[model samples]
Target: AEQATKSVLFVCLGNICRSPIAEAVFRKLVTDQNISENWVIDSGAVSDWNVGRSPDPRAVSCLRNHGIHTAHKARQITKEDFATFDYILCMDESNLRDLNRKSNQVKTCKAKIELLGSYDPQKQLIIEDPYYGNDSDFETVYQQCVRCCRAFLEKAH
Candidate 1:
């Protein structure tokens, strides 16, 4: 049998903003650059708010500007996620804290928990949640995700 694909799980407070955008940005880059096979990418929420809902309107709109679209629904992070993903990358310090807390409860966690921006070429250590911000904020996030995802994929290869 073939081995399991390498997996990455993006995470955020609500999953409607940052994480979904990150996931979409990464997916687009993978597709556009022909680097997708043998990879399993996904995103989830640190909290349960907005579970099952689509990403925020501003986030979807921002991604559309990059000629990308996402169909992810909000879902809470689970302990099983720790064992399934090779990397669990979150947007900011708050998400890091939440994942760290949750990981402690999982007995078989094998994933590395870290900030997604840790790979940012721009050295932006955090990808802020744009929940209450304007369209421009989402644009900023789109740009950051692009830079970070590009750098991340470069490192992955």
Candidate 2:
């Protein structure tokens, strides 16, 4: 059977934090809504820093607090991803520029690259990096991800 499922790739600087949180949040939303079968969801980094690592412990902990589970590993975004995903939603403007630069290098860029937080009803344009912050920062990241993912799913569906 031909698959018509749409694909999404969430991206952040390290992939261990914001991107994974976004992926998990969006995936869980689709799962709880019983619409997971129609989409392919994943997350990656703009850089190679955390490639092959699991989502940051703080990210895992924050999601666990909200009853979401994730088994995602960090990976750097490849040029091929530009051609593969339907939407390449990222965390902030730095990553937005980074991803757009990388995508422009690809011969065929198919994804709609944009800030994930742009979907927030509250209009938070950036999902800041939490690597240097405390647990409260991690919580903030999770909260923003939840808001954006919900709004994004509503639009996507």
Candidate 3:
């Protein structure tokens, strides 16, 4: 039998910051490993605040610095996401709570919702909001994403 495609959705309060970075980082990881074809990856928001916007400029630049580029538009998580994605990874506790509550409303929810930072080998459990912070803060988020995404991918397969 053909291998099933594994899917993951990264989420944050607003898709412009943390989630987008995490999504891009994970995408880069899979692409670098030449396993991108076996995965379906995306990112979304827990709120409607940034729904049509591109990722934060700092977040975009942060990834660009690492030789990664993302064209992801901010979107809110949907009921279909709960049933379609194999994993719904989020930035913080609030995102976790929002995803869990939303998944509860979907009768066919199959995604395992959890904080993306939970996979961080450094034990940093929360990927904080960097919108209000400076470029350095965005870099910190990027570093955290790299660590967490790397660890998650290692365990996922």
Candidate 3 lDDT tens digits, 34-126: 888989999999999888999999999999999999999999889999989999999988888888888888899889998999999999999
The TM-scores of all predictions, comma-separated, are 0.95, 0.95, 0.96
Report every candidate's CA lDDT: 0.89, 0.91, 0.92
- Clashing residue pairs, candidate 3? none
lDDT of 1 at 152: 80
Ranking by TM-score: 3, 2, 1
Query: Alpha carbon lDDT of residue 46, candidate 3?
Result: 90
**Model 1 spans with C-alpha error above 4 angstroms:** 1-4
Which pairs, if any, clash in model 1?
A: none
Candidate number that wins on TM-score, 2 or 3: 3
What is the Cα-based lDDT of residue 19 in candidate 3? Answer: 91
Query: Candidate 2 lDDT, tens digit per residue, 1-157?
Result: 4436889999999999899999999999889988889889999999998778998899899999999989998899998999999999998889999998998889999899989989999999899999999899999988898899899887873
Alpha-carbon error at 43 in model 2, in Å?
0.3
Error of 2 at 103 (Å): 0.9
2 or 3, greater by lDDT: 3
